[PDB]
């Protein structure tokens, strides 16, 4: 129904996204910042083989590429509770510390919803999958996020780094919010009878009736697909009068 019509708007059917209108991002440093190289902490064999699959996937998607840089931060295998699944988690504290700050133009998780008029009772909530990875990193800033990766009988031994905005980077939330705000501006002007709330990668569309919500959602998904974003079809809440958004429950 809603999936078949917009295959490029869903993560499950469109694959990894890529914001086609966003130029590669350059990351400004603080004036006195200098490169930091924290060597990779030793890792249990179970851990390394545990994250290999995630690292390999990332490399297949071209999100990770080999490199060599004077920057380097530790990669930590984070054991998922209950299961024997390890997720690669990088500690960018030392890098975040050296990057120039950005003043979040982000409204607020509360004052946001409080603006919603009671006149719009129909909602559609969407969360974008791997939002940060949809924004590319300019090759000049890529070296900042480098880390070590080695695996004997695998294929490589050295440093890897990201070609997309990484997790753990203090400025990703804001950078993605601003980018998505730029990409969805026209949508707003083209649909003044709809209310569009957006906080980083979580979206809420409000209409004055089930019909407008239906048509508004179709237009939104269409727009997200064209742009290269991907929402979670699994967690989507389409044209409902009661939905949960940002932890809050609406009725």
Swiss-Prot record:
Binding site for RNA: 41, 91, 93, 107, 171, 173
Signal peptide: none
Binding-site residues, Mg(2+) 1: 127, 201-202
Residue span(s) of domain Reverse transcriptase: 59-250
Cofactor: Mn(2+); Mg(2+)
Cofactor mode of binding and number, as noted: Binds 2 Mn(2+)/Mg(2+) ions for ribonuclease H (RNase H) activity.
Summary of subunit composition and partner proteins: The reverse transcriptase is a monomer (Potential). Interacts (via RNase domains) with host release factor ETF1; this interaction is essential for translational readthrough of amber codon between viral gag and pol genes, as well as for viral replication.
Other remarks in the entry: The reverse transcriptase is an error-prone enzyme that lacks a proof-reading function. High mutations rate is a direct consequence of this characteristic. RT also displays frequent template switching leading to high recombination rate. Recombination mostly occurs between homologous regions of the two copackaged RNA genomes. If these two RNA molecules derive from different viral strains, reverse transcription will give rise to highly recombinated proviral DNAs.
Function: RT is a multifunctional enzyme that converts the viral dimeric RNA genome into dsDNA in the cytoplasm, shortly after virus entry into the cell. This enzyme displays a DNA polymerase activity that can copy either DNA or RNA templates, and a ribonuclease H (RNase H) activity that cleaves the RNA strand of RNA-DNA heteroduplexes in a partially processive 3' to 5' endonucleasic mode. Conversion of viral genomic RNA into dsDNA requires many steps. A tRNA binds to the primer-binding site (PBS) situated at the 5' end of the viral RNA.
Protein name: Reverse transcriptase/ribonuclease H
Lineage: Viruses, Riboviria, Pararnavirae, Artverviricota, Revtraviricetes
